[PDB]
């Protein structure tokens, strides 16, 4: 039948990175969630006219099992690099993350995008400019999310899925 | 009919609930959402206990009311006023007579002694499994000596005489089986040889059975205070949340020490033993319900240095590579077959905490704080009850001990275990990458062979527990 | 996992937070601290089936005698405990079969009568007597020691496998 994407979220800890999930998964209107239940992280969805499954793995709370990342990350076809753009040390892991996940899928060009999340009113420290050349020299998308309002959400994982198709 | 109430301007208890104040889910009532007095209220209701409620509430209370404020409400809904004579009490009065005084008598044994009693069970509750409010504020202790011990009356005495030793005792502060332990286990390093320790030459049943008794311990010690509010994960999460981190931090160690024992066996034979023997650690592991240890292996087996080695892979047997696909399966599917497995053994296990890190954080980001109903801000109290089903998940596994015996020594080694030395993260794990294509490099660049490193026997003396008289 | 709500009841002081604490986290309690209500859950296998015990242990003492029908409403199995060393508190036993039969409206309710303080020399209540008021129930009597787990486990899982056959 329909083609199930296996995407995992990666980033630093603390910082609002489940909010991203969160919100796509969500009943978008009603600000509830059970993360308990079984299938609160697969969701049917049309791209591009293309009806699909989303799989999504997001080990948020778990960063300090540093020893499990490589298995965790293994279980995916594309990633969504997260940071927080008012953590400037998030931004700063996202080299490492990148090139575990290339260690781990054993690949230079691992379907990926960079998502520079808001998840509070604290003051930005990284500047959209800086993120969109930390994307381009990396040759993969940038997209900005909010945690409170949902935008951005559907574009990071939408234009994830492309480059899974287009790869 | 009902008890009459004291007047609602006296004693704020008795406002009519309302949905400007509490909210019910679709046998007594669970609680959506509520205004602070509404919940003290149910928390402490006449006409039923609700000990699951005392937990949860307990548990989770300070993301919406201070321990200060608390212990102010629960002295508030403490004191509760007596009714004034009725009529038929007035006309005895009168005649020089005895009143009756049948409401009053109702309203003290079905109303004030209830809610008085379950008062002091939330104070009990409190002092007993919350004790931390009180050792962070040494003034919250002593305005709860105040209370207990001012409480006058026979009705409450023996609790609050008891509770007041309880609380004694808690400022200044053993296990029995039927069944004899089973006798420790050696293979090549013998009694108090310490030196010789290592993967090979400690039996692995030991192995297993030490590890797992640290593992136990390491789950055992966490308090629910370390999990609500996400504070595991926070920039103070070294003061608020050390036994957790302390018992990740162990897991992550000796996930590591697995890699490290593999990749640096260069020779491929004795690394084929090196496997072999980390896979009969985790038949043991599994025997024992110790699923983090399990997860610890199939953890370091997953990982990138260890997981391209398909010329060592090629060479363990087929039921080792049997039992190692089979525990990896656990985790699949988002734990599907972990959960299932957890819910059916018999205890005592080590479950593995991150999912119940993971589902906490969930629970926490993705629910609001307050639900807003007719103009009112209600505390959401569901949000709290699904945290605290997971705290009481976590705590109803760290009941159960193990019936295994401790070898201090070897207790010792793993305790000390530090595979990364005084190496960084990154420059330890790009080291045991670069072991890993050093000793099956890359294709098409050819396989090199390399000298032994072990000078005792590599055979496994096997993982079935043997007994002598 | 099937779910099952038993009840430790009798009077102050014969064992029941003891008891339970015992078979919950293989502790003896030497302290008798009166308890209000407390309540505890342990998952176990028991003839081959997982199941999740919620155990709620009551308060003996007198003074909380009027707040019982709202936990026998609940409970679908009572665990009766009197101690051997205490002939009020066997005698106190009929006052809570009665009891919850009355709540519970039923004359066929799952309940096991508990002699505790079994490592005690100085017994004072017969095994024969408990014997004779268990068989006019129609329920086993089970003695067990909480200090030495003697019964611990055949009073609780015994009451487990009466409300299984309910
Ligand atoms: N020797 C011995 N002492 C016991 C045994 N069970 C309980 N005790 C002791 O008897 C005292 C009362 O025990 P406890 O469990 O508090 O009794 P309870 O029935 O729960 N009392 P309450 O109804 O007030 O809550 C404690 O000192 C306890 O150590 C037993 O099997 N043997
Ligand atoms: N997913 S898994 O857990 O089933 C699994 C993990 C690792 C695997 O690669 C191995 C490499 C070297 C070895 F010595 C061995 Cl035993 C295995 C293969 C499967
Ligand atoms: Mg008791
Ligand atoms: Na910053």
């Known amino acids: ?167 | 009919g009902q008890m009459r109430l004291p007047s609602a301007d006296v004693y704020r208890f008795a406002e009519p609930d309302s949905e400007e104040n509490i909210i019910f889910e679709e046998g007594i009532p669970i609680i959506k959402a509520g205004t602070v007095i509404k919940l003290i209220e149910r928390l402490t209701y006449h006409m039923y206990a609700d000990p699951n409620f005392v937990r949860t509430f307990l548990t989770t209370y300070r993301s919406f009311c201070k321990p200060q404020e608390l212990l102010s409400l629960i002295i508030e809904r403490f004191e509760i006023p007596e009714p004034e004579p009725t009529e038929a009490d007035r006309i005895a009065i009168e005649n020089g007579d005895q009143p009756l005084s049948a409401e009053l008598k109702r309203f003290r044994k079905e109303y004030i002694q209830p809610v008085q009693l379950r008062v002091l069970n939330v104070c009990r509750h409190w002092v007993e499994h919350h004790f931390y409010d009180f050792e962070r504020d040494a003034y919250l202790l002593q305005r709860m000596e105040e209370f207990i011990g001012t409480v006058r009356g026979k009705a409450m005495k023996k609790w609050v005489e008891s509770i007041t030793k309880i609380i004694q005792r808690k400022k200044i502060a053993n296990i029995t089986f039927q069944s004899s332990p089973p006798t420790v286990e050696w293979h090549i390093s013998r009694p108090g040889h310490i030196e010789t320790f290592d993967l090979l030459t400690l039996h692995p049943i030991e192995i297993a059975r030490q590890l797992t008794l640290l593992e136990s311990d390491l789950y055992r010690a966490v308090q629910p205070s370390e999990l609500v509010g996400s504070v595991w994960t926070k920039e103070d999460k070294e003061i608020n949340s050390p036994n957790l981190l302390k018992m990740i931090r162990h897991t992550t160690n000796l996930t590591l020490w697995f890699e490290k024992c593999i990749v640096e066996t260069e020779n491929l034979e004795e690394r084929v033993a090196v496997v072999s023997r980390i896979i009969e650690i985790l038949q043991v592991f599994q025997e024992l319900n110790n699923f983090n240890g399990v997860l610890e292996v199939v953890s370091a087996m997953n990982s990138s240095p260890v997981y391209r080695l398909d010329h060592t892979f090629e060479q363990i047997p087929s039921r080792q590579k049997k039992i190692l696909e089979e525990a990896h399966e656990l985790s699949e599917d988002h734990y599907k077959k972990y959960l299932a497995k957890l819910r059916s053994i018999n205890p005592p296990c080590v479950p593995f905490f991150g999912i119940y890190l993971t589902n906490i954080l969930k629970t926490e980001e993705g629910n609001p704080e307050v639900l807003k109903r007719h103009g009112k801000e209600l505390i959401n109290f569901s949000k709290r009850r699904k945290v605290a089903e997971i705290t009481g998940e976590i705590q109803q596994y760290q009941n159960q001990p193990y019936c295994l015996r401790v070898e201090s020594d070897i207790k010792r080694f793993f305790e000390n275990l530090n595979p990364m030395g005084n190496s960084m993260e990154k420059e330890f794990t790009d080291y045991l990458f670069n072991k890993s294509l050093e000793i099956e490099p890359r294709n098409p660049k050819p396989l090199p062979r390399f000298p032994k490193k072990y000078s005792y026997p590599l055979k496994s003396p096997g993982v079935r527990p043997s007994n002598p008289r």
Do not use: W
């Open chain 1, 1 to 167: 039948g329909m083609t199930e994407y296996k995407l995992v979220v990666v980033g630093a800890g603390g910082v609002g990175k489940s909010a991203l999930t969160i919100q796509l998964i969500q009943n978008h209107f009603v600000d509830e969630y059970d993360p308990t239940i079984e299938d609160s992280y697969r969701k049917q969805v049309v791209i591009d006219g293309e009806t699909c499954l989303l799989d999504i793995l997001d080990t948020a709370g778990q960063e300090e099992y540093s020893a499990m990342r490589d298995q965790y990350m293994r279980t995916g076809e594309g990633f969504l690099c997260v940071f927080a753009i008012n953590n400037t040390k998030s931004f700063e892991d996202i080299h490492q993350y990148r090139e575990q996940i290339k260690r781990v899928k054993d690949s230079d060009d691992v379907p990926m995008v960079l998502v520079g999340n808001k998840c509070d009113l604290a003051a930005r420290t990284v500047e959209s400019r800086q993120a969109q050349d930390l994307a381009r020299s990396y040759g993969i998308p940038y997209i900005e999310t909010s945690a409170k309002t949902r935008q951005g959400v559907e574009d990071a994982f939408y234009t994830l899925v492309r480059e899974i198709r287009q790869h």
